[PDB]
């Protein structure tokens, strides 16, 4: 003991960038209070059994640890320290230890074998370090081990078959790591165990057909690994489980219909493999199940309609697969549903009744089915909802009676359907809203002036409809629109000067349109557009010297209207622009030659005008094809089409 005092003092010499302030100051006199006053020091008959230094700053080595002289320890915990080197053998020495940590720390090498000769070991934990190597084998010896966690390493090789032998182990972690190889079966032999965590690692081959003897199991965690083969049915007996979370693996084959005998499973995460065939009807027999997530599969056939007794059901997640048939109507009918995606799959019919019917559903997903129907009016109704995607199928019905007021909307995508009617004022209830798309559908009439009282909204897609009218000035009040897209509508008369205000606009589209009149002249307060289309309309007259204020413009593309007059050679200011597009248009004079200057314009169009003269000097001159040039007056100096 005075010896054992003298021993660690000699270990605490060795120490590195400590400080007065140190937790170990109080090791002094070593001679008579080792025992009473020493800080992490605590002992039994006068003898040290217990060095619990975690998380007490000390930077050093176990190369000068005193292992000879503490025979008696059986509680080291030395984590949450500034430890470097190696596990040295030693280790294994201490014939009482019973719980061993030196888990944060920053050692290196390998787990030292001779851990195994620690057989009254219970807890042995060495997450959060860079440890490589194999996992010794001889740590299956420890029978009477409750809990293994060796997380967050360097681990290679495979998991030991001995750790079968391991009858009292309840968790087994081994997450962080890169084990390799298959999970050898005897892990079945586990009994006792409760938590078993590979997930994180670069496992291969199949599942063990025998993890079904594992019936005190609750938490299988084995997912982002490289696991091949098919989900055993044994799985189902794992009787135990409340998450089964196997994603991102590389499994195959169908969805063993034992998976319902599993009556404690909350969680279930099937996701990013590649599972084929059909869900069992008798997945819908989990009836503790509240995450269930099998996305990303090739799944075929239609969902179960016995999913109507999945009463705890809160997230569905069957997006990216290949379901078909009618989505049944027992999938949207849990009281306590919050989120149903269903996107990318191959649904057909129309959306059942259920699908709002509580009240509490909040994310709807239906992107790039075949669907088609009327919005059943539960949804309508729905005030929960959050975020609604519908693009890119055949939904029907007028626009305006199909949707109710929204005041929880944040995100909805109408975009490639066949809504009808006329934009309702109702969407401005919509106070959170930040997106509203719904590109390529027959909506007709004005834009109700209450959309631009939508301050909150951010992007603004209603292109490529039968929108007509007169675009007001108080189009000016969205103040955070940065995406808007108006194109392909048949909005007529002058584009307003109010969208001068739109200060955070970055992409604007205003294309194939009936927009008649001078651009405005005003227009010359966007510092963040990259982006302006205000082809296939009907302006004319000379272009605007505002739109050479706005900086940042990548692409601008005037064509196929009946602006005249000479292009500004104040263009100049536009350092960035990448694409000028000014085709089809009664442009004269002379290119400004200028456009030297302009560094990055590479696509230029200037075909099917008045001008004259010699082209500039720059790239896209050079590199234009005889459409991009022709259809002007007098073109070039030597009258070329290529090749100065
Ligand atoms: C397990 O890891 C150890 C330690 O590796 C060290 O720590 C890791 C977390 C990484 O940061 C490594 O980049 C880092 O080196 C490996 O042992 C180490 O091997 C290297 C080379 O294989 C040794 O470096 C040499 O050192 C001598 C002088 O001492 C030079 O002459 C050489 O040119 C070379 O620089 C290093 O000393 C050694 N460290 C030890 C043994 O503590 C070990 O190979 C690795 N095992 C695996 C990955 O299976
Ligand atoms: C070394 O000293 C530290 C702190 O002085 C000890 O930390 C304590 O460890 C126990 C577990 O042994 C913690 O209790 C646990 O609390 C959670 C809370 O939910 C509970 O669920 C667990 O079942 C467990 O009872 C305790 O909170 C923790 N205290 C602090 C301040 O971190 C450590 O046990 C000592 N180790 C040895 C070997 O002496
Ligand atoms: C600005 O918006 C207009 C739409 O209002 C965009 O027009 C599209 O431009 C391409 C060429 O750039 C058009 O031409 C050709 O169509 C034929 C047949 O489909 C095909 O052979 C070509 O490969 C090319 O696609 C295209 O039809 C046209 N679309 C429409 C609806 O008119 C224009 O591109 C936008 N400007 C910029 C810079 O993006
Ligand atoms: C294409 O433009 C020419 C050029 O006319 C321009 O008219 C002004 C707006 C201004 O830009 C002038 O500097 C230009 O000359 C049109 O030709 C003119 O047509 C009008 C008849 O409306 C006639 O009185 C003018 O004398 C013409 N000018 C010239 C130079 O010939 C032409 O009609 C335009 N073509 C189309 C299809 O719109
Ligand atoms: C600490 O370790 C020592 C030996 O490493 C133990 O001392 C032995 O105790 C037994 C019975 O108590 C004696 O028969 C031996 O002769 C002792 N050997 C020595 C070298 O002293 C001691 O009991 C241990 N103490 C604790 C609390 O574990
Ligand atoms: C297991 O599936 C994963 C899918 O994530 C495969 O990883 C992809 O492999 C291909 C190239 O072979 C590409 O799609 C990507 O480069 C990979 N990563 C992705 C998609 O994130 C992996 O190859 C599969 N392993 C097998 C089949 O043994
Ligand atoms: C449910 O919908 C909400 C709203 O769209 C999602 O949360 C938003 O996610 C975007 C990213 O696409 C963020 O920019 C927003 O800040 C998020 N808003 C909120 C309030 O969190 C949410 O991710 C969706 N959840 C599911 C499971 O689909
Ligand atoms: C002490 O801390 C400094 C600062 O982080 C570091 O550069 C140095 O390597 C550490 N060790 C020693 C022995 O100085
Ligand atoms: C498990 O323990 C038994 C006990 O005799 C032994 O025979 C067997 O080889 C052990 N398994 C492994 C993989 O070492």
Redesign the pocket.
Known sequence: TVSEANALLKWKSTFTNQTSSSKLSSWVNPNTSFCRSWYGVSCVRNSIIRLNLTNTDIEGTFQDFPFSALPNLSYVDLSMNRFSGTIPPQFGDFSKLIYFDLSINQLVGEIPSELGKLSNLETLHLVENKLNGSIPSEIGRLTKLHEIALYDNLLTGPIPSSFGNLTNLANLYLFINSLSGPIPPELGNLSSLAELCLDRNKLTGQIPSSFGKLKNVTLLNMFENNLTGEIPPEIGDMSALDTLSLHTNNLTGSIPSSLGNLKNLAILHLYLNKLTGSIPEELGDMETMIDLEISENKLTGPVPGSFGKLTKLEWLFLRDNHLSGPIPPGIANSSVLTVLQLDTNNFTGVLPETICRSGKLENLTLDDNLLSGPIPISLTNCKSLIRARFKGNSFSGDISESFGEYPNLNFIDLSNNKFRGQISPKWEKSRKLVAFIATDNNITGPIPPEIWNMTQLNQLDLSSNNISGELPETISKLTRVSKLQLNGNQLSGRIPSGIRSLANLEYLDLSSNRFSFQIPATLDSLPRLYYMNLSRNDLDQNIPMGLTKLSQLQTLDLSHN?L??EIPSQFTSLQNLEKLYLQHN?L?GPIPSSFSEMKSLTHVDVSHN?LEGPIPDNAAFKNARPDALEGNRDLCGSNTTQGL
Do not use: K, L, P, V
């Open positions: 009946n005249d007059g009664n004269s008045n």
